[PDB]
């Protein structure tokens, strides 16, 4: 069971937020589907849920701001959040909830515990416009070394907004990789760096390419990293 979600990501203040989640798992009918948000460095907050029937329950605090919809033909469900504020900047998650049960004398949600989850969608509320990153190589010294290990990386500079996804050799090497949290520059544009430590011998023999993806600007960059020589 797999959950994919796509969304605007960047929003001016007071605009509505619209996110859509696609369920490829099958068993779309079986369970309710929930939206849950997490502002950066804070706790999880349950927004609401819905059934292919389209019956839905919302968080009482966020009431009159929440709409949820279902597209049974495409196996999708969506979230609508009115009048966005910087307060609402968070990561919004797709999640499979509990079943919606209909009984003779009672109708309710049962076992409303969330599993599995989506990768999430970071929503930024700002008036600033989007901007694609520049990808620069962090070249290895090519020095004799007295140590087996060598370090190489990518510098992803000047982009907005968050986030950026960095991979190495299309996920072939994951060991010893470190992608640092982005830093907010004075310019107001985000920057980050991703590095990997490898055996020094492999520098000449093995090709190293980082794969930078910036979804909001739809920029996909592959940069070859080789010793300066």
């Amino acid at each position: 069971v797999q959950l994919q979600q796509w969304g605007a990501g960047l929003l001016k203040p007071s605009e509505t937020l619209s996110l859509t989640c696609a369920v490829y798992g099958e068993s779309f009918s079986a369970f309710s589907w929930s939206w849950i948000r997490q502002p950066p460095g804070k706790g999880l907050e349950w927004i609401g849920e819905i059934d292919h029937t389209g019956s839905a329950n919302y968080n009482p605090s966020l009431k009159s701001r929440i709409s949820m919809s279902v597209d049974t033909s495409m196996n999708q469900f969506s979230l609508e959040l009115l009048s966005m504020t910087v307060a609402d900047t968070a990561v919004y998650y797709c999640a499979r909830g509990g079943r919606k049960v209909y009984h003779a004398y009672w109708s309710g949600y049962v076992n409303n515990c969330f599993d599995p989850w989506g990768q999430g969608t970071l929503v930024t509320v700002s008036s600033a416009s989007t901007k694609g990153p520049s990808v620069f190589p962090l070249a290895p010294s090519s020095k004799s070394t007295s140590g087996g290990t060598a370090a190489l990386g990518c510098l992803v500079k000047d982009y907005f907004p968050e986030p950026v996804t960095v991979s190495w050799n299309s996920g072939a090497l994951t060991s010893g990789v470190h992608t640092f949290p982005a830093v907010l520059q004075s310019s107001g544009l985000y920057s980050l760096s991703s590095v990997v430590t490898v055996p020094s011998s492999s520098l000449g023999t093995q090709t190293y390419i980082c794969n930078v993806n910036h979804k909001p600007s739809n920029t996909k960059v592959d940069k070859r990293v080789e010793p300066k020589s």
């Binding site: 929930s34 706790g43 999880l44 907050e45 349950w46 329950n57 968080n59 009482p60 998650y93 509990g98 949600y109 076992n111 409303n112 515990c113 969330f114 599993d115 599995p116 989850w117 989506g118 990768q119 999430g120 520049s134 620069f136 190589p137 962090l138 070249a139 010294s141 140590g147 290990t149 370090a151 990386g153 510098l155 500079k157 470190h178 992608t179 640092f180 949290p181 982005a182 830093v183 520059q185 920057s191 980050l192 760096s193 590095v195 430590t197 300066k228």
Partner: protein, 213 residues
């Protein structure tokens, strides 16, 4: 309506120790409608336990859940470095609510950073900006100091640093510092040095390069 309070806020334990996580509810939780989640950095929460004590599929046996009514408890028998994460309790007796979370951190022996310094690329120099990056790799604990010296001159206010979370394998941190210069100023000086001070180092370690060498 139902409020969940988690204690402690922060938990710092060595590997192999047993961890006790508490969850307190404003109202009784009906039946056994309680769930625990494990959230690792850069990742979506994963269901650990539901029904107070039922292990989710793929979950190690060291994780256990107990309690009822007002008091619930999650217990990790034998801690692992991969078990470093944030843990949330959730009730689904009523409309779903979460605890504020309890962060579990790993304690280990002191480790000294491996230091690398990276020159700005020729590609970037066309932009009219130079970024010099200093990498501090796999050191514990966190307190670390990075000095930028450009041609023997200490740099302040033109650098920023970024620290990773505790590593899944070895519980260590990694740090990156970026020194930002204009193309003009960068071409003026020869020696760019990165000086690292850390507990694991008996004496400060300095990595440097000569521009255009």
């Amino acid at each position: 309506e139902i409020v969940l309070t988690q204690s402690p806020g922060t938990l710092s334990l060595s590997a192999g120790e047993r961890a006790t996580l508490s969850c307190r509810a404003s109202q009784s939780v009906s039946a056994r409608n309680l769930a625990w989640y494990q959230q690792k950095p850069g990742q979506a929460p994963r269901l650990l336990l539901y029904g107070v004590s039922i292990r989710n599929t793929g979950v190690p046996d060291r994780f256990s859940g107990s309690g009822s009514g007002t008091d619930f408890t999650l217990t990790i028998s034998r801690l692992e470095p991969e078990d470093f994460a944030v843990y949330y309790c959730q009730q689904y007796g009523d409309s779903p609510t979460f605890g504020q979370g309890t962060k579990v951190e790993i304690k280990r022996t002191v480790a000294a950073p491996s230091v690398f310094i990276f020159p700005p690329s020729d590609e970037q120099l066309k932009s009219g900006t130079a970024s010099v990056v200093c990498l501090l790799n796999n050191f514990y604990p966190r307190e670390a100091k990075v000095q930028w010296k450009v041609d023997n001159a200490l740099q302040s206010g033109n650098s920023q640093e970024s620290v990773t979370e505790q590593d899944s394998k070895d519980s260590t941190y990694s740090l990156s510092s970026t020194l930002t210069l204009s193309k003009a100023d960068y071409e003026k000086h020869k020696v760019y040095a990165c000086e690292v001070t850390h507990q694991g180092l008996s004496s400060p370690v300095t990595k440097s390069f000569n521009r255009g060498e």
